């Protein structure tokens, strides 16, 4: 369990994807030319995970995205062969990405995926970043996932999917696209981090006091969260070391693998608070719903499993105490029938900018609130049958929408079942 | 007369290092294998060039730990064919250790065991070191134990299990893995010494005076207590001189073969009497498994003293405890405490937090109070299996769901077996 | 199972291999299928040294089986006078009853063990004890034509 | 222990008889060359006369189950057996004083009697034993003769006239025999002959010659008999009769004129189907399917080569990236196989078979629907020609989905397995070697949904070829997997 192959698809996919590579290239001490200028062994200890030069494949039907990446800061480092791009775009049509146009290109992509996997000592799994309200990131991404799932069934599939919200784009077909994509992810992926644009806006607007957040502002929150959750994977550490062990200790039921991520402290684009947080303060950004990357209230549900990642030099004794504290002082919020369901890990290397930080990966049943929002928007649209001729024209059947609608509602019911469950 | 040791998973492998480090100091053997100085050849073989090689196999479904074994201080001690590694680990999944991944390497492992058994003339049996909660430790060991009961069926096999503890626990599913291996390894094990990592944690925090112990801290403490049990096999004592005697003295029921080990004294490096250390053997604080023997009946009890000990001091300390405490025995037991002594002093590691003591004792006692330890696992197991939590991982790697229930019933039946003896 | 080899030995009468199996901590009161301890079996087939070996190691002198038979029942049935007095000296139940209502006095009288009958009587046997059908030991001598036994029962 | 059946020690022969009895119940029904207690029947003729009454009885009950393990075809060698076996059976089995030694010897003769075409050859051999010293032998062998009749009867007997004389001849001496039992059990044999053709015949031939008191009791016995003069139905049938009854208990609209579609094709077809634009390919296929194939109901058998059209349907079903173009193609392939039955002999069948099996990988319900339904078409018209071998090949394939679907395919085919002939079909030539070794790879898969398909695909196998024949790999399987396999065996039909 060593190497990880990375993929980014669609506009958003390559945006937050490149942002992620910017962050962890710095943290590992790699320059845009691809040369080590660090000063620690903990940097090159597990560099073989994400690098060889990144083990990253860039995909989009939109050919313009090609240049938006290479003209970016770390755009020079990606392998030219691993760029695989179509002629036209999907235009917010999930069917075009999944059945027609996105399907024609997916073979070219699998050829490069094979190439990178071929020269791996021991593959762990895969890693995809994409948006769910689009046509390419959602339609072709979910199609790529299934196509890999069947070509590499002995490997992990881990996705960073961002949820659409009316606050960030008023496109009304996004409820369709996201619902169809969730119908795929519940069956095809081992673990999925739920990045909610609804919550990214509400954090930049209300907590960071930015009247008009841009994509870059929301992408800053994302790239920092990704480096936080992937800290265990990229540096030496006992707990939650590889992808499979993580999913083993996070996912008790195969379909319920949608994590609500959140981390602290919340900073703006290059602002410094001048005051480093304390360990009990960081700990008290867990239930603090203003730090959740998904627009859900953990108070309104129950945690099935929790993974905490504290970065920086601090007291391992105090972290254990504070985590053991906050668990039992809110004992009604953690499921009783899974003992020792919260697991904490520490990494001495902090993220750049911050002296201390803490990321809070949680499988909370409150996540059903998120899927409620998508379904109600989907159903309002679907009951009046708006824009259906887009999808049906591309070979889709009207029945598919009903199945995805019903399958998401079963997913909501399941979360509600285990929320109301008792140990007695 | 020989005995082969096997180490499975990180737990087995890393405790193995601590034990063979401690064996080589007790036998004056060098890291390169030489010796400027038999009973000890029960454990070691000999090269034509005056080199002493352990009779040991190291197994892990993942290089990282054994790679450090293969390049550690004791890299020259082992033959490279003894250190076996896979590539994909079991990922805390009994199914992968036993079914999916374990079958890919089980034959290579059994083959390398035959090479050490072919060097031996009168092989006694096997010592096995492994964790409970680990995927490799649970799954692969239970498989290897099944296959050793075939290819070597007519001889003994002893376990050294690491009972899990939330303070160092790496996985949620550790109750599952413990129950699953204990079910399938029950019939194939003649005797099995459990090690509760919580007690070793508690001991290291209280008596070694450490805030947050590391694995080295726990392993060194554990390696001392393992040495105390295997001392009889390595120096030709009077008690427990071969592997059969362990079953004779401690196992009056094939299933109930889980002795409680108590070790005194654990002295920080920053002397006691014979009577004082023997009283500490009946203090729960110094047990390796957290339970209360006062709530149970003793089926057997052995005392393995080593060091500056006068045989009469022992008999006085015995009569004191047999008169001034109420150690309840079962009526169908000899009720007499067996004793053995080895006048060599307890060796510690140069630099270790554990201090050199003048004398030491390790009490092995098959008390029915150890059922409390099984009850704690069974309860945790029940909570998760009531909702079928994490079960899809196991079933998805070649395992039938029924095996969960068949294992749970075998654990409930064992809990009744402990009850009926003690009433 | 070591408790099963000790039954095999105590029955077939290998005096030496009892000490071997018992030195390995075999269950002195190990039950077979019908609840018979080794003391039962040795007292049936007349192995006096094996009886005294098991008794002094702690053998239930008044252990019953699935049919309520004590070793004193079986010794008085087959007619092992040497073993009967060993059991009684080790606190055997002289007026034990079994599932058919018989005492050891019933069995020794039926089988014509006049020498054992007198030993049981002097250890306080119940001469008026009845079985299921309602017959005493004295009724058995009347029914069976034994006048040597009728006189030995009224002594 | 094969030669131990004739060992000097009795308790060593006693084993081999139990060993044999366990073999004839646990052996393969088609049968191992090890089951050579037919070609040398002197063997069991020796065993039945064992010099130990306890090991004798065990030899007879081994002969008994042997003599019912022979209930399978072809064992026309039952003539040689009755000659070799029933004289030892009568002489010393019926003779025996042992309760069970006798009962199984009679039951043995029963099974040898129904091996035959009629009762005459068995009767003719056991008649001489009526003239033996020992009464209890003639006492018994007149009872056995009497109950080979009351349950079987005289049918398919060449010369009944010669047979009736041969069995009526001793009846005067038997009925005046000293033994009470020989007499009492002779009146029963008389009744059982009357019960089949009396009273008129035997009153002139036999009843005249008996004691008057005797012929009174026989008349009293005929009044108590109710039922027609010959019994309407026999209480037991022979082997050739029961099989004929079982076989007794157990126009095609295709005559329509054939239509030709080659003329229907358009010019802009070959480039359209081999185009890079997906909608070109879709419309191309969708047109010739909805306009050209869906209307027709019978294609032209004579002189029409579709193996140019069918090999381009294969090219898309295998390699075409458009899942929609696949779905509409497999539905076309089915239509060809459906409206043109008896055409897909080899070239046609094999041109699309291995492509279809590759594409079961598709998980979209509509697409798996069409691919599988097409594979059902080629199967129903290529029976087991190339599919049986290649379906196995793709059960061994790496994709999880193709394993579960190609195994479900074998399950579908196996339910519609009704090949002609008694035995030795393509299924049996490769059953244990290939089919079972491959189905176990599914039964022992890592995934549950995969394993669960194997559990049906093994319970549909046992249903076809006997849950006893495959009891060998059943034992090697987990007791836990066993009760899942049996679960489906109880609910599965053919
Ligand atoms: N006392 C002690 N416990 C250990 C040691 N190593 C691991 N453990 C415990 O064993 C349990 C399972 O961990 P491992 O044994 O490392 O798992 P593994 O056998 O290597 O199996 P995989 O890593 O999944 O392939 C954990 O709860 C640890 O606390 C050790 O060196 N000493
Ligand atoms: N957080 C974030 N969300 C984005 C970004 N770009 C697009 N989105 C969201 O993703 C959805 C649009 O999908 P998009 O990725 O642009 O379409 P695609 O190119 O076909 O994958 C909308 O809900 C947007 O709000 C970005 O840079 N950051
Ligand atoms: Mg776009
Ligand atoms: Mg490990």
mmCIF file with all atom_site columns, C-alpha atoms in Angstrom, chain D residues 119-257:
data_model
loop_
_atom_site.group_PDB
_atom_site.id
_atom_site.type_symbol
_atom_site.label_atom_id
_atom_site.label_alt_id
_atom_site.label_comp_id
_atom_site.label_asym_id
_atom_site.label_entity_id
_atom_site.label_seq_id
_atom_site.pdbx_PDB_ins_code
_atom_site.Cartn_x
_atom_site.Cartn_y
_atom_site.Cartn_z
_atom_site.occupancy
_atom_site.B_iso_or_equiv
_atom_site.pdbx_formal_charge
_atom_site.auth_seq_id
_atom_site.auth_comp_id
_atom_site.auth_asym_id
_atom_site.auth_atom_id
_atom_site.pdbx_PDB_model_num
ATOM 1   C CA . UNK D 1 119 ? -40.544 -64.306 -12.675 1.00 0.00 ? 119 UNK D CA 1
ATOM 2   C CA . UNK D 1 120 ? -39.795 -67.584 -14.462 1.00 0.00 ? 120 UNK D CA 1
ATOM 3   C CA . UNK D 1 121 ? -35.975 -67.688 -14.394 1.00 0.00 ? 121 UNK D CA 1
ATOM 4   C CA . UNK D 1 122 ? -35.895 -66.849 -10.688 1.00 0.00 ? 122 UNK D CA 1
ATOM 5   C CA . UNK D 1 123 ? -38.710 -69.240 -9.825  1.00 0.00 ? 123 UNK D CA 1
ATOM 6   C CA . UNK D 1 124 ? -37.148 -72.069 -11.850 1.00 0.00 ? 124 UNK D CA 1
ATOM 7   C CA . UNK D 1 125 ? -33.935 -71.819 -9.812  1.00 0.00 ? 125 UNK D CA 1
ATOM 8   C CA . UNK D 1 126 ? -35.496 -71.692 -6.327  1.00 0.00 ? 126 UNK D CA 1
ATOM 9   C CA . UNK D 1 127 ? -37.907 -74.575 -6.994  1.00 0.00 ? 127 UNK D CA 1
ATOM 10  C CA . UNK D 1 128 ? -35.432 -77.443 -6.252  1.00 0.00 ? 128 UNK D CA 1
ATOM 11  C CA . UNK D 1 129 ? -34.986 -76.159 -2.684  1.00 0.00 ? 129 UNK D CA 1
ATOM 12  C CA . UNK D 1 130 ? -38.507 -77.403 -1.871  1.00 0.00 ? 130 UNK D CA 1
ATOM 13  C CA . UNK D 1 131 ? -37.011 -80.935 -1.871  1.00 0.00 ? 131 UNK D CA 1
ATOM 14  C CA . UNK D 1 132 ? -34.421 -80.280 0.862   1.00 0.00 ? 132 UNK D CA 1
ATOM 15  C CA . UNK D 1 133 ? -33.890 -82.115 4.154   1.00 0.00 ? 133 UNK D CA 1
ATOM 16  C CA . UNK D 1 134 ? -34.402 -79.073 6.385   1.00 0.00 ? 134 UNK D CA 1
ATOM 17  C CA . UNK D 1 135 ? -38.106 -78.220 6.848   1.00 0.00 ? 135 UNK D CA 1
ATOM 18  C CA . UNK D 1 136 ? -37.576 -74.587 7.877   1.00 0.00 ? 136 UNK D CA 1
ATOM 19  C CA . UNK D 1 137 ? -35.845 -74.078 4.517   1.00 0.00 ? 137 UNK D CA 1
ATOM 20  C CA . UNK D 1 138 ? -38.771 -75.495 2.542   1.00 0.00 ? 138 UNK D CA 1
ATOM 21  C CA . UNK D 1 139 ? -41.083 -73.846 5.100   1.00 0.00 ? 139 UNK D CA 1
ATOM 22  C CA . UNK D 1 140 ? -39.473 -70.505 4.221   1.00 0.00 ? 140 UNK D CA 1
ATOM 23  C CA . UNK D 1 141 ? -38.735 -70.916 0.507   1.00 0.00 ? 141 UNK D CA 1
ATOM 24  C CA . UNK D 1 142 ? -42.407 -71.712 -0.085  1.00 0.00 ? 142 UNK D CA 1
ATOM 25  C CA . UNK D 1 143 ? -43.285 -68.430 1.662   1.00 0.00 ? 143 UNK D CA 1
ATOM 26  C CA . UNK D 1 144 ? -40.782 -66.566 -0.520  1.00 0.00 ? 144 UNK D CA 1
ATOM 27  C CA . UNK D 1 145 ? -42.087 -68.204 -3.693  1.00 0.00 ? 145 UNK D CA 1
ATOM 28  C CA . UNK D 1 146 ? -45.585 -67.219 -2.556  1.00 0.00 ? 146 UNK D CA 1
ATOM 29  C CA . UNK D 1 147 ? -44.654 -63.524 -2.213  1.00 0.00 ? 147 UNK D CA 1
ATOM 30  C CA . UNK D 1 148 ? -42.703 -63.188 -5.441  1.00 0.00 ? 148 UNK D CA 1
ATOM 31  C CA . UNK D 1 149 ? -46.152 -63.921 -6.906  1.00 0.00 ? 149 UNK D CA 1
ATOM 32  C CA . UNK D 1 150 ? -48.584 -61.885 -4.794  1.00 0.00 ? 150 UNK D CA 1
ATOM 33  C CA . UNK D 1 151 ? -46.540 -58.733 -5.499  1.00 0.00 ? 151 UNK D CA 1
ATOM 34  C CA . UNK D 1 152 ? -45.271 -59.467 -9.034  1.00 0.00 ? 152 UNK D CA 1
ATOM 35  C CA . UNK D 1 153 ? -47.306 -62.114 -10.876 1.00 0.00 ? 153 UNK D CA 1
ATOM 36  C CA . UNK D 1 154 ? -47.133 -64.033 -14.155 1.00 0.00 ? 154 UNK D CA 1
ATOM 37  C CA . UNK D 1 155 ? -46.624 -61.574 -17.022 1.00 0.00 ? 155 UNK D CA 1
ATOM 38  C CA . UNK D 1 156 ? -44.153 -61.618 -19.937 1.00 0.00 ? 156 UNK D CA 1
ATOM 39  C CA . UNK D 1 157 ? -43.695 -65.347 -19.264 1.00 0.00 ? 157 UNK D CA 1
ATOM 40  C CA . UNK D 1 158 ? -42.801 -67.226 -22.455 1.00 0.00 ? 158 UNK D CA 1
ATOM 41  C CA . UNK D 1 159 ? -44.450 -70.589 -21.694 1.00 0.00 ? 159 UNK D CA 1
ATOM 42  C CA . UNK D 1 160 ? -46.716 -70.179 -18.665 1.00 0.00 ? 160 UNK D CA 1
ATOM 43  C CA . UNK D 1 161 ? -48.053 -73.708 -19.257 1.00 0.00 ? 161 UNK D CA 1
ATOM 44  C CA . UNK D 1 162 ? -44.624 -75.263 -18.633 1.00 0.00 ? 162 UNK D CA 1
ATOM 45  C CA . UNK D 1 163 ? -44.146 -73.014 -15.589 1.00 0.00 ? 163 UNK D CA 1
ATOM 46  C CA . UNK D 1 164 ? -47.469 -73.756 -13.870 1.00 0.00 ? 164 UNK D CA 1
ATOM 47  C CA . UNK D 1 165 ? -46.848 -77.506 -14.148 1.00 0.00 ? 165 UNK D CA 1
ATOM 48  C CA . UNK D 1 166 ? -43.355 -77.121 -12.690 1.00 0.00 ? 166 UNK D CA 1
ATOM 49  C CA . UNK D 1 167 ? -44.595 -75.261 -9.588  1.00 0.00 ? 167 UNK D CA 1
ATOM 50  C CA . UNK D 1 168 ? -47.806 -77.279 -9.140  1.00 0.00 ? 168 UNK D CA 1
ATOM 51  C CA . UNK D 1 169 ? -45.919 -80.609 -9.214  1.00 0.00 ? 169 UNK D CA 1
ATOM 52  C CA . UNK D 1 170 ? -44.541 -80.500 -5.621  1.00 0.00 ? 170 UNK D CA 1
ATOM 53  C CA . UNK D 1 171 ? -47.683 -78.969 -4.050  1.00 0.00 ? 171 UNK D CA 1
ATOM 54  C CA . UNK D 1 172 ? -49.207 -82.400 -3.225  1.00 0.00 ? 172 UNK D CA 1
ATOM 55  C CA . UNK D 1 173 ? -46.111 -83.530 -1.305  1.00 0.00 ? 173 UNK D CA 1
ATOM 56  C CA . UNK D 1 174 ? -45.655 -80.106 0.318   1.00 0.00 ? 174 UNK D CA 1
ATOM 57  C CA . UNK D 1 175 ? -49.270 -80.097 1.561   1.00 0.00 ? 175 UNK D CA 1
ATOM 58  C CA . UNK D 1 176 ? -48.815 -83.603 3.019   1.00 0.00 ? 176 UNK D CA 1
ATOM 59  C CA . UNK D 1 177 ? -45.431 -82.719 4.534   1.00 0.00 ? 177 UNK D CA 1
ATOM 60  C CA . UNK D 1 178 ? -44.783 -83.473 8.200   1.00 0.00 ? 178 UNK D CA 1
ATOM 61  C CA . UNK D 1 179 ? -43.954 -79.909 9.300   1.00 0.00 ? 179 UNK D CA 1
ATOM 62  C CA . UNK D 1 180 ? -46.941 -77.802 10.323  1.00 0.00 ? 180 UNK D CA 1
ATOM 63  C CA . UNK D 1 181 ? -45.307 -74.710 8.812   1.00 0.00 ? 181 UNK D CA 1
ATOM 64  C CA . UNK D 1 182 ? -44.586 -76.330 5.432   1.00 0.00 ? 182 UNK D CA 1
ATOM 65  C CA . UNK D 1 183 ? -48.279 -77.214 5.198   1.00 0.00 ? 183 UNK D CA 1
ATOM 66  C CA . UNK D 1 184 ? -49.722 -73.943 6.552   1.00 0.00 ? 184 UNK D CA 1
ATOM 67  C CA . UNK D 1 185 ? -47.412 -71.983 4.233   1.00 0.00 ? 185 UNK D CA 1
ATOM 68  C CA . UNK D 1 186 ? -48.396 -74.196 1.280   1.00 0.00 ? 186 UNK D CA 1
ATOM 69  C CA . UNK D 1 187 ? -52.081 -73.284 1.570   1.00 0.00 ? 187 UNK D CA 1
ATOM 70  C CA . UNK D 1 188 ? -50.935 -69.669 1.206   1.00 0.00 ? 188 UNK D CA 1
ATOM 71  C CA . UNK D 1 189 ? -49.108 -70.459 -2.047  1.00 0.00 ? 189 UNK D CA 1
ATOM 72  C CA . UNK D 1 190 ? -52.222 -72.251 -3.330  1.00 0.00 ? 190 UNK D CA 1
ATOM 73  C CA . UNK D 1 191 ? -54.376 -69.210 -2.535  1.00 0.00 ? 191 UNK D CA 1
ATOM 74  C CA . UNK D 1 192 ? -51.926 -66.917 -4.332  1.00 0.00 ? 192 UNK D CA 1
ATOM 75  C CA . UNK D 1 193 ? -52.251 -69.091 -7.437  1.00 0.00 ? 193 UNK D CA 1
ATOM 76  C CA . UNK D 1 194 ? -56.043 -69.123 -7.083  1.00 0.00 ? 194 UNK D CA 1
ATOM 77  C CA . UNK D 1 195 ? -55.838 -65.353 -6.491  1.00 0.00 ? 195 UNK D CA 1
ATOM 78  C CA . UNK D 1 196 ? -54.567 -65.069 -10.070 1.00 0.00 ? 196 UNK D CA 1
ATOM 79  C CA . UNK D 1 197 ? -56.379 -67.879 -11.968 1.00 0.00 ? 197 UNK D CA 1
ATOM 80  C CA . UNK D 1 198 ? -58.835 -70.063 -10.009 1.00 0.00 ? 198 UNK D CA 1
ATOM 81  C CA . UNK D 1 199 ? -60.984 -71.657 -8.711  1.00 0.00 ? 199 UNK D CA 1
ATOM 82  C CA . UNK D 1 200 ? -61.709 -73.911 -11.698 1.00 0.00 ? 200 UNK D CA 1
ATOM 83  C CA . UNK D 1 201 ? -58.153 -74.819 -12.712 1.00 0.00 ? 201 UNK D CA 1
ATOM 84  C CA . UNK D 1 202 ? -56.612 -76.021 -9.439  1.00 0.00 ? 202 UNK D CA 1
ATOM 85  C CA . UNK D 1 203 ? -59.691 -77.928 -8.244  1.00 0.00 ? 203 UNK D CA 1
ATOM 86  C CA . UNK D 1 204 ? -59.185 -80.376 -11.116 1.00 0.00 ? 204 UNK D CA 1
ATOM 87  C CA . UNK D 1 205 ? -55.386 -80.396 -11.014 1.00 0.00 ? 205 UNK D CA 1
ATOM 88  C CA . UNK D 1 206 ? -54.589 -80.041 -7.306  1.00 0.00 ? 206 UNK D CA 1
ATOM 89  C CA . UNK D 1 207 ? -57.475 -79.653 -4.822  1.00 0.00 ? 207 UNK D CA 1
ATOM 90  C CA . UNK D 1 208 ? -58.717 -83.164 -5.652  1.00 0.00 ? 208 UNK D CA 1
ATOM 91  C CA . UNK D 1 209 ? -55.539 -84.661 -4.160  1.00 0.00 ? 209 UNK D CA 1
ATOM 92  C CA . UNK D 1 210 ? -55.455 -82.900 -0.766  1.00 0.00 ? 210 UNK D CA 1
ATOM 93  C CA . UNK D 1 211 ? -57.078 -83.845 2.521   1.00 0.00 ? 211 UNK D CA 1
ATOM 94  C CA . UNK D 1 212 ? -60.785 -82.866 2.605   1.00 0.00 ? 212 UNK D CA 1
ATOM 95  C CA . UNK D 1 213 ? -60.225 -80.680 5.683   1.00 0.00 ? 213 UNK D CA 1
ATOM 96  C CA . UNK D 1 214 ? -57.566 -78.872 3.641   1.00 0.00 ? 214 UNK D CA 1
ATOM 97  C CA . UNK D 1 215 ? -59.734 -78.028 0.623   1.00 0.00 ? 215 UNK D CA 1
ATOM 98  C CA . UNK D 1 216 ? -62.399 -76.725 3.018   1.00 0.00 ? 216 UNK D CA 1
ATOM 99  C CA . UNK D 1 217 ? -59.978 -74.195 4.521   1.00 0.00 ? 217 UNK D CA 1
ATOM 100 C CA . UNK D 1 218 ? -58.957 -73.152 1.007   1.00 0.00 ? 218 UNK D CA 1
ATOM 101 C CA . UNK D 1 219 ? -62.600 -72.494 0.124   1.00 0.00 ? 219 UNK D CA 1
ATOM 102 C CA . UNK D 1 220 ? -63.102 -70.545 3.360   1.00 0.00 ? 220 UNK D CA 1
ATOM 103 C CA . UNK D 1 221 ? -60.012 -68.593 2.292   1.00 0.00 ? 221 UNK D CA 1
ATOM 104 C CA . UNK D 1 222 ? -61.504 -67.754 -1.120  1.00 0.00 ? 222 UNK D CA 1
ATOM 105 C CA . UNK D 1 223 ? -64.668 -66.227 0.371   1.00 0.00 ? 223 UNK D CA 1
ATOM 106 C CA . UNK D 1 224 ? -62.555 -63.879 2.498   1.00 0.00 ? 224 UNK D CA 1
ATOM 107 C CA . UNK D 1 225 ? -60.775 -62.909 -0.732  1.00 0.00 ? 225 UNK D CA 1
ATOM 108 C CA . UNK D 1 226 ? -62.501 -59.965 -2.409  1.00 0.00 ? 226 UNK D CA 1
ATOM 109 C CA . UNK D 1 227 ? -61.442 -58.546 -5.757  1.00 0.00 ? 227 UNK D CA 1
ATOM 110 C CA . UNK D 1 228 ? -61.535 -59.601 -9.400  1.00 0.00 ? 228 UNK D CA 1
ATOM 111 C CA . UNK D 1 229 ? -60.415 -63.069 -10.496 1.00 0.00 ? 229 UNK D CA 1
ATOM 112 C CA . UNK D 1 230 ? -57.092 -61.753 -11.809 1.00 0.00 ? 230 UNK D CA 1
ATOM 113 C CA . UNK D 1 231 ? -56.007 -58.715 -9.781  1.00 0.00 ? 231 UNK D CA 1
ATOM 114 C CA . UNK D 1 232 ? -56.572 -55.465 -11.642 1.00 0.00 ? 232 UNK D CA 1
ATOM 115 C CA . UNK D 1 233 ? -53.239 -53.924 -10.598 1.00 0.00 ? 233 UNK D CA 1
ATOM 116 C CA . UNK D 1 234 ? -50.045 -55.573 -9.335  1.00 0.00 ? 234 UNK D CA 1
ATOM 117 C CA . UNK D 1 235 ? -48.659 -54.429 -5.958  1.00 0.00 ? 235 UNK D CA 1
ATOM 118 C CA . UNK D 1 236 ? -45.209 -54.326 -7.614  1.00 0.00 ? 236 UNK D CA 1
ATOM 119 C CA . UNK D 1 237 ? -43.841 -53.866 -11.142 1.00 0.00 ? 237 UNK D CA 1
ATOM 120 C CA . UNK D 1 238 ? -40.694 -55.011 -12.922 1.00 0.00 ? 238 UNK D CA 1
ATOM 121 C CA . UNK D 1 239 ? -37.883 -52.726 -14.060 1.00 0.00 ? 239 UNK D CA 1
ATOM 122 C CA . UNK D 1 240 ? -38.871 -52.639 -17.734 1.00 0.00 ? 240 UNK D CA 1
ATOM 123 C CA . UNK D 1 241 ? -42.520 -52.069 -16.765 1.00 0.00 ? 241 UNK D CA 1
ATOM 124 C CA . UNK D 1 242 ? -42.039 -49.191 -14.321 1.00 0.00 ? 242 UNK D CA 1
ATOM 125 C CA . UNK D 1 243 ? -39.800 -47.338 -16.787 1.00 0.00 ? 243 UNK D CA 1
ATOM 126 C CA . UNK D 1 244 ? -42.370 -47.737 -19.576 1.00 0.00 ? 244 UNK D CA 1
ATOM 127 C CA . UNK D 1 245 ? -45.081 -46.322 -17.300 1.00 0.00 ? 245 UNK D CA 1
ATOM 128 C CA . UNK D 1 246 ? -42.876 -43.362 -16.356 1.00 0.00 ? 246 UNK D CA 1
ATOM 129 C CA . UNK D 1 247 ? -42.252 -42.689 -20.046 1.00 0.00 ? 247 UNK D CA 1
ATOM 130 C CA . UNK D 1 248 ? -45.985 -42.913 -20.709 1.00 0.00 ? 248 UNK D CA 1
ATOM 131 C CA . UNK D 1 249 ? -46.694 -40.395 -17.935 1.00 0.00 ? 249 UNK D CA 1
ATOM 132 C CA . UNK D 1 250 ? -44.014 -38.104 -19.401 1.00 0.00 ? 250 UNK D CA 1
ATOM 133 C CA . UNK D 1 251 ? -47.523 -28.016 -35.329 1.00 0.00 ? 251 UNK D CA 1
ATOM 134 C CA . UNK D 1 252 ? -44.929 -25.209 -35.525 1.00 0.00 ? 252 UNK D CA 1
ATOM 135 C CA . UNK D 1 253 ? -46.052 -21.730 -36.660 1.00 0.00 ? 253 UNK D CA 1
ATOM 136 C CA . UNK D 1 254 ? -42.580 -21.392 -38.302 1.00 0.00 ? 254 UNK D CA 1
ATOM 137 C CA . UNK D 1 255 ? -43.963 -22.485 -41.738 1.00 0.00 ? 255 UNK D CA 1
ATOM 138 C CA . UNK D 1 256 ? -44.469 -18.802 -42.698 1.00 0.00 ? 256 UNK D CA 1
ATOM 139 C CA . UNK D 1 257 ? -42.779 -17.584 -45.890 1.00 0.00 ? 257 UNK D CA 1
#
